[PDB]
Ligand SMILES: [Ca+2]
Ligand SMILES: [Ca+2]
């Protein structure tokens with residue numbers, strides 16, 4: 001009676017209750033059972049008739065669209081790209097909501113339930129022709145890196161912790177995390193969006209221990225990271241292939257995606273073998289298949305070509321099968337003595353495959 | 362379209378028009394906003410409810426640079442990541458709500474000692490009567506040269522008076538609410554008697570390296586004070602217009618000096 | 625940064641005042657000159673198109689460098705010769721004609737991850753030695769997804 005805005009929590013409710021229910025039930029008996037949409041549109045009309053189109057336009061922006069407040073992906077991105085912990089983020093959230101009345105940041109459970117779309121292991125896919133020794137479930141995130149290596153007082157003692165994904169899981173998650181880029185490339189190169197030809201992906205790998213990352217008579221520890229990055233995507237169209245995806249900066253820091261990491265050495269050969277051999281098993285497995293998953297509308301297919309390159313010099317002398325660094329045979333590509341390079345300088349060629357080193361072993 | 366619901370629901374137009382005309386007499390704006398707000402509140406989507414309450418309340422999008430400073434320092438953020446957060450909410454929202462760093466430094470040097478005027482009615486011998494003096498070295502002109510005694514301790518300090526006037530000015534709404542709540546006016550002079558307790562403590566080692574393993578034990582110690590009780594004697598008696606609810610916290614021990622030595 | 629800073633022509637100008645002989649002056653001038661003439665091929669991300677004039681020089685510009693390394697400096701490069709020189713001397717153009725670029729396919733991209741690993745261990749942790757790398761991996765992945773960095777690069781109208 002004083003005003004609706006001077007009225008309390010249900011004061012306005014019991015004041016205009018009969019008018020409220022009569023026009024609401026008249027509307028949902030009129031327009032097929034919805035009152036909110038028709039009521040909002042008539043409120044926009046009734047406000048914007050009074051030369052106040054600014055609030056009407058921002059309201060039409062924020063309902064059925066974007067505007068004030070933030071999408072959860074935005075607040076996740078700005079949480080992670082400042083490395084802020086959760087608790088201080090919560091404090092920032094609660095004081096912003098306390099000051100401005102609005103709700104611009106999101107709460108934390110709403111953060112995680114938008115996070116789970118961005119790990120590996122969310123989206124369905126089909127390996128065809130399927131992969132031996134590979135569990136076919138598509139709900140795989142973190143598993144332990146030991147592959148359940150039985151470890152008790154009678155066996156070999158192990159001391160390391162390693163966490164990893166599977167290879168195909170992180171691979172499809174990285175593929176779906178660039179749908180905007182590949183669709184942009186197909187739009188810009190005068191192609192059709194409805195094309196599910198067999199794309200070819202070329203992927204770089206990398207592995208270099210990051211020793212002495214210890215924290216406190218000072219005894220250290222080391223750690224090895226194994227990582228990869230999508231590098232070039234093309235598609236054989238007609239009689240030629242054409243790039244949909246190159247990279248601006250290949251060796252960037254913010255475009256090198258992890259795959260596995262361990263608290264071990266680069267020289268303790270045993271634990272390094274016993275951890276990395278599942279990964280090389282999967283890597284050998286998916287070199288003879290196609291991949292099928294839904295990429296924004298139509299499902300598409302994939303093949304692969306790998307180039308393990310980002311090993312330094314010492315590691316590739318240590319895992320491919322050469323001796324230590326101070327040898328006489330020096331070039332990891334050709335086969336010449338160190339003493340030979342002093343006489344003849346520049347006349348060799350690359351002559352070291354992988355299977356050749358297998359048969360030489 | 363615009364015209365489709367206008368013709369299909371002109372019945373609702375004339376209905377709520379005349380019904381606001383006959384209930385309280387013609388405030389179609391207010392009843393229509395409350396009815397749409399009740400329509401959307403019922404959906405349990407209350408974020409839109411108080412967003413609409415904010416926009417039709419006429420609330421401001423951006424905020425104080427002062428509260429920006431408080432939220433900056435209570436998360437321990439560098440200026441760089443603050444610039445990241447500022448530019449991303451600018452580019453995303455379209456309107457700017459967090460504030461750039463000019464305003465942060467400008468609201469900052471409001472709060473430091475050395476911005477306000479102040480005076481002493483006795484002239485304070487050996488005290489520099491300059492009021493624009495904040496952070497200076499604690500060495501007070503000590504020679505650490507090769508002809509002198511060797512010292513190494515790095516000292517940072519204010520003066521005692523400027524910190525005192527700053528720590529008295531920042532609690533201004535506390536003392537005003539003490540004047541209102543304990544039945545006095547604003548226009549009451551002092552003299553206010555101020556109970557200041559003081560403290561000083563070493564903190565152990567404060568460093569760690571990575572390079573040559575075993576680092577050194579850098580010992581450190583700060584000197585500090587606390588405003589805890591503001592009293593005023595008016596009339597016949599005195600009245601404690603500020604009592605500190607907890608003097609031994611980590612929010613109410615303002616520092617004076619820092620030095621890197623042993624106790 | 626030290627590696628880039630030490631390679632100036634002016635550093636050769638600086639060391640020339642500490643050595644007497646003209647022979648050593650012109651030798652070191654030609655040395656650093658040829659090394660800077662041959663640097664950007666293996667250094668860039670797309671040298672087949674970006675600096676492609678120095679591509680076809682590289683055989684000639686390497687052979688003369690090797691020969692004046694032999695004759696003028698047989699005091700040191702007569703027996704032992706370090707292997708990186710053999711790599712940067714005799715295997716670059718075969719690789720480039722094989723594989724396009726070089727400096728794309730580098731280990732630069734991961735070795736700078738030390739700061740990310742250390743900071744993630746420090747500030748976002750639970751300290752239980754089994755989750756304590758799990759959340760590190762989760763945050764490290766959540767960093768490097770491109771769908772989020774597109775949002776962070778929004779200020780690019
Ligand atoms: Ca290494
Ligand atoms: Ca390294």
Ligand SMILES: [Zn+2]
Pocket residue numbers: 331332333334335336348349710714715
């Ligand atoms: Zn060779």
